[PDB]
Ligand binder design. Structure first.
Ligand SMILES: OC[C@H]1O[C@H](O[C@H]2O[C@H](CO)[C@@H](O)[C@H](O)[C@H]2O)[C@H](O)[C@@H](O)[C@@H]1O
Ligand SMILES: OC[C@H]1O[C@H](O[C@H]2O[C@H](CO)[C@@H](O)[C@H](O)[C@H]2O)[C@H](O)[C@@H](O)[C@@H]1O
Ligand SMILES: OC[C@H]1O[C@H](O[C@H]2O[C@H](CO)[C@@H](O)[C@H](O)[C@H]2O)[C@H](O)[C@@H](O)[C@@H]1O
Ligand SMILES: OC[C@H]1O[C@H](O[C@H]2O[C@H](CO)[C@@H](O)[C@H](O)[C@H]2O)[C@H](O)[C@@H](O)[C@@H]1O
Lengths: 330, 330, 330, 330
């Protein structure tokens, strides 16, 4: 197995942890964050969104025992001090949100790890990879990024549409669940004033680099897509609303058929396809990073259409972080 | 003053009632619904969304006294039996949702009213009117419709954009507050399965005829716009997200300037314009039916842009119902 | 197995259905409600609160096939016309909310059923039974009631406390999740004005007969307990807050120990006990009808204490409906 | 007028500011917090809970002009450096939550203020005062505390009940709106694990010192009251549920009459009384710190009763902070 250390035990770190338990190719052997082992165990056991942990959790000698396996727990602020080699870590899932450059993340490698996956968009030239879009472009780099949840939804769908019909131009909106960066009542948010406004009370316009980041994982789409977000009062699951103008005429039936073909073929397990009367909670726990909603989309004409795709912004992204870890470890 | 009777005391009937109190051109003299006078008074006095009624409410002899004025209260199922002439009603605000055809609505005129305004889209050829779009096309008809809240947001903005730059084609999404037709927990909704799913828990895709209805109030846009909705867990205020391809190149600055010009001129009081860091609650109580959000929109290029406009789906629409009543009574 | 027919496919009918699938003593063979088979299948498959159905659902020839078993689907308004004998139904779970008297419910027996369990408090002298409190008092009656969800939480806890320390008097509050009887925005609720007010926006005081109904399943407590409710904006899981004056002095530790003893003994599977830092979502899916929260309670002194117990108002109650069906079928 | 400086521009600081505008006895002349003047102006202008500021707000030369009055804006971390004498501040409203002892708060007086009101419970022996309970006990002290919002609700009601009927013992629950200390999704809360759980998803048991603090403002009740809280998914307005055993027999009618008498007399403007079918949003903006809900309460017998009283945890408390400022400045 690939031995993995998780840096940061926020929503992504904890859902990565849960998603890892079912895999045979990877084992989590260590977690680092500014939390006691007892508090870590509590956060793992009980989850408002995803329910009780499926398995056993005990604290012994200041470390965790999960499904009978020992997991080293540390609280180091400085990544260079993590002593990853002491527990034989191969790959670090870097999930704090604080170390999204080569200089910062590389400290994991100084500390004994072989490779690092950032669980957010890199802030420098560190390459990004999105399953279904460009895992095949991985070129042995020791530090990589899995981009963001919204990019993991938009890119696989954009690729299918562009490959079959040619995207001339597109504009995207994500209607996005509330996240940890938001506030329960109007409070300070110096760099994002709207995002400080009470989350349960409001539809809140927000920026997203996702559509543009698609141009990084799919260079053929560079400059052809951009977008924005609205944060709304749900605790999880989000939806992409993609409006595109197409080079080749395609009826809505042709579009449905092309997406369904991908979902059952090349992009199975990444891209999903439904014709059911679904709502966001139907995707709580969804592993596919993009589930096309056939009945929700609408075409104005054969060259101008609005497509709708769901994503569990916690679960899909977290599973694909693990997919990328396995991928770079081949 | 124009004497008005309200049929139906649901959200629109009650907010129409409140909005009328500040006007000098119109007086509400009668309300009909299947509710006691005491229960009517209760629903008027206390409102979760809009706060306490600003004024006095008393029940006397089975009727209402509001701000010292007597208001006849009846509970007739059959519009033909409403005896509107007995209280000198000029115009009926038909707000039950049940009488959206000429045959049904005309019964108000049989009962002694002179004209009728439906507070929803007509279901037959009854003409629709939207302030800012086509009030000037009113041709003395005795029964009319004020269309819907979403159409009142989309049409004024669409007209400004089309008049200045030429809309080749557009697709719209409304991110829309929860309404009375929805359910608190998953329950039966035979004709709209998704709309039966628990409203506080879900983003729910929903249909809307609004974009197409724009083609009815602005014939020049017939066939060029369509759209869809997502219902989200907020109790009021919604937002239009309009993606358009333009005939004439226009920078985002040109677009902002054109909307601001309308908001300060021809469409003052209908179309609004802001550059502030607003969120949906900032429009709770908004009287403009469309408030353009400059900072939230985004252009991909000079001919392809996404525009954002807010509307209080209760208050703006209700004020414009009254505007239409005054308009047809000139 | 006991063959069961469900009348009414609302929240209780559907969660009863799901909870039955794991049992070996009971099989659901028929469902009746004013819903198509296709719509029934949809409501079974997708649940906002409890996630996707664990198993297979198909519609064939206007009936359902669930986990490979055929289930007759009908839409009869009149219980006497249900033809329960045609599918060999032993016991009816009467979950419509409409037939809570002997006269009405007995029509199930005229139609060929042997016994009936109402899934709500009876409205006449039909006896009520609550597991942990008085199943042992069942005396072969053909029509019974499982009381209500709140009574199923309060009664087992009240019995433990009274049996060990003697309840002189108590007053209860339930902080209760939003239910189907409530409204998404302020709307008509002629017989319960507060309960018509928008559910997602409000704390709403509400009546409950639960504390008094305890006096029916535990006659020794008749007249000694009453209470009230507050409905709050959560979609499921509620909590009892019970304030009692005790005859025998008992420290809080003694109280904890007595509840834990019951939870591990006589009342295992009915009454639960936790000392963890739990919140309501931690009980979504809880099968125990009452889970005592040790850390949340507080004693003023050895004879006056406030005790806190959680219940999943859908799941616990539904499992105990099935328990009562098995019990009366012994 | 009394010149007031506000330290901290969180929910209490901002609602204090708004509530001050209508007063003639007090003027706010200065605000200090780690926020730009432009950001301060934004937070003042738009409020999700209380709507748009009623008046004018401009930023000039790095300070604020509000309703035509200049307000000095500073960003000093150290209270001793506040230079309150430079703007002639008489009293400081200390609303940061960080300086709740004599040592810390007194630094405002070193910096030129004459007196200080903490807008939260003191953490040392600094005396607390609650209008309706013990303003009359103020003995000229230069540093005081207005206690907490829950204490301002419980104490006036407790005093009326005790003065008329004698409280032998009581236990209180507050069902309390979400606050700024809570989290939008499950996140770290090292000293309060439950309070880190997602606020919009959960009923969350929480501690409160309020009932015990009543014993500080009303020494006759020392040791006779304690309580707990449940935080629920509403953005504002909370409710006290007080269960008391009484020395003198009192029917519920006697209790209602005694509370109504206080609300119309000695405690007018502090304690309110309603018999209407109210819900929490009906108190959004409520100035009374305790509004008795006659119809919601319930008596088991003449000596054991549960009483219900509403409070806008932002607005009532903030108005009474100002009342205390005026009181100590007499
Ligand atoms: O930080 C000072 C600036 O705050 C706002 O801009 C931030 O917040 C916006 C959302 O409200 C973001 O779109 C923007 O990218 C942030 O920079 C304010 O709009 C600016 O004018 C202030 O300078
Ligand atoms: O009423 C039977 C049909 O119900 C669904 O379709 C309705 O509900 C949809 C939203 O879930 C609407 O979009 C649609 O317009 C309604 O007709 C179901 O999708 C259909 O297959 C059923 O025949
Ligand atoms: O139906 C007319 C009555 O409505 C109210 O009372 C109902 O609603 C209350 C909750 O708001 C319930 O407590 C009460 O049991 C219901 O009867 C109103 O309070 C009454 O005065 C009206 O007569
Ligand atoms: O900080 C370590 C402790 O955390 C919890 O206790 C805190 O959180 C509780 C609410 O979950 C509060 O009631 C309590 O007062 C806090 O101290 C945990 O319950 C403790 O066992 C941990 O030691």
């Amino acid at each position: 197995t690939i031995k993995v250390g998780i840096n940061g035990f926020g929503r992504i770190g904890r859902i990565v942890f849960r998603a890892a338990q079912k895999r045979s190719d990877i084992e989590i052997v260590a977690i680092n964050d500014l939390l006691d082992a007892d508090y870590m165990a509590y956060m793992l056991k009980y989850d408002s969104t995803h329910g009780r942990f499926d398995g056993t959790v005990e604290v012994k000698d200041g470390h965790l025992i999960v499904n009978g396996k020992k997991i080293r727990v540390t609280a180091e602020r400085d990544p260079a001090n993590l002593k990853w080699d002491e527990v034989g870590v191969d790959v670090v899932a870097e999930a704090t949100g604080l170390f999204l450059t080569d200089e910062t993340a590389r400290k994991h490698i100084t500390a004994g790890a072989k490779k690092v996956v950032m669980t957010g968009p890199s802030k420098d030239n560190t390459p990004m990879f999105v399953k279904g879009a460009n895992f095949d472009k991985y070129a042995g780099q020791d530090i990589v990024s899995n981009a963001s949840c919204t990019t993991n939804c938009l890119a696989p769908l954009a690729k299918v549409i562009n490959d079959n019909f040619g995207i001339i131009e597109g504009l995207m909106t994500t209607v996005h669940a509330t996240t940890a960066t938001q506030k329960t009542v109007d409070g300070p948010s110096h760099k994002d004033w709207r995002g400080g406004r009470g989350a349960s009370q409001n539809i809140i316009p927000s920026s997203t680099g996702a559509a543009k980041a698609v141009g990084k994982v799919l260079p053929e789409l560079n400059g052809k897509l951009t977008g924005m977000a609205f944060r709304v009062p749900t605790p999880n699951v989000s939806v992409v609303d993609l409006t595109v103008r197409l080079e080749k005429a395609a009826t809505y039936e042709q579009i449905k058929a092309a997406v369904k073909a991908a979902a059952e073929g090349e992009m199975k397990g990444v891209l999903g396809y439904t014709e059911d009367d679904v709502v966001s909670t139907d995707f709580n726990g969804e592993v596919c990073t993009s589930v096309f909603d056939a009945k929700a989309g609408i075409a104005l004409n054969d060259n101008f259409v609005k497509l709708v795709s769901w994503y569990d912004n916690e679960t899909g992204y977290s599973n694909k972080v693990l997919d990328l870890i396995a991928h770079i470890s081949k």
